[PDB]
């Protein structure tokens, strides 16, 4: 699970979703009543989206289960370097937004290093949360020599201890109410000098809006 994290207060992360194809394999974010944003390495031909979840193993009553109608990965996704690790999912029908199911805002601009963010995901299986800062690009590049592109950002602590892990990919990194990152990759989890690397969403706002409008 998210290491060094804490259990999120019940339904305190209403934009968080679970990607299911028989079992939970990735996370995602609801950016509007019919579209979800996640990571491209979370791609599967058939995906069921589960919203309003807290305990992923029990039917609590506020969950909405919707099948994905369209899965669109970034045209420039690279499965080896992981550059442009972003994917859009259109739901079968619009979901009902409430206190347990809501949307998150796309970034107004790129958040600066030092900005405190909230990472969430599942890895009872309850939603886990983590407070961590966006790290400076130079600290990111130094942790992963020659592997960081301008579309990636590092979030966490260079001393390890706190990090996102397997089961969290596609999940949100929200800073000041705006989605600024998507859980993507890293070397190990919570390993010192190897903080999680995330997709820099501010670099895709236009692609995201263009794609949604056209589909």
């Amino acid at each position: 699970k998210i290491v060094g994290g804490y259990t999120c207060q019940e339904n305190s992360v209403p934009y968080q979703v679970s990607l299911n194809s028989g079992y939970h394999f990735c996370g995602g974010s609801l950016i509007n009543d019919q579209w979800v944003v996640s990571a491209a390495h979370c791609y599967k031909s058939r995906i069921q989206v589960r919203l309003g979840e807290h305990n992923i193993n029990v039917l609590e009553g506020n969950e909405q289960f919707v099948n994905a109608a369209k899965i669109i990965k970034h045209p420039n996704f690279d499965r080896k370097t992981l550059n442009n690790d972003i994917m859009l999912i259109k739901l079968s029908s619009p979901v009902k937004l409430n206190a347990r199911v809501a949307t998150v805002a796309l970034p107004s601009s790129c958040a600066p290093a030092g900005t405190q963010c909230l990472i969430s995901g599942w890895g009872p299986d309850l939603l886990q949360c983590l407070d961590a800062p966006l790290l400076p690009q130079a600290d990111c590049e130094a942790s992963y020599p020659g592997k960081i592109t301008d579309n990636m950002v590092c979030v966490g602590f260079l001393e390890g201890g706190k990090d996102s892990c397997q089961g969290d990919a596609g999940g949100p990194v929200v800073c000041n109410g705006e989605l600024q990152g998507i859980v993507s990759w890293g070397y190990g989890c919570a390993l010192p000098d190897n903080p999680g690397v995330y997709t820099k969403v501010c670099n895709y706002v236009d692609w995201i809006q263009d794609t949604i409008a056209a589909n």
Partner: protein, 56 residues
């Protein structure tokens, strides 16, 4: 038996949670492991039949 069949399972850097199969030499059969979603090595199968056929 191919050498990639003796290598330990490789989760990878990605953080997806995908269940795959790998040949466990120590045990003598194919078992499941959590695959991260990218950079899969060869001892990584989508099923036990393929794993057993290939490395068995």
């Amino acid at each position: 038996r191919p050498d990639f069949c003796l290598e330990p399972p490789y989760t990878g850097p990605c953080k997806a949670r995908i269940i795959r199969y790998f040949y466990n030499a120590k045990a003598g059969l194919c078992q499941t492991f959590v695959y991260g979603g990218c950079r899969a090595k060869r001892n990584n199968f989508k099923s036990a039949e393929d794993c057993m056929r290939t490395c068995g």
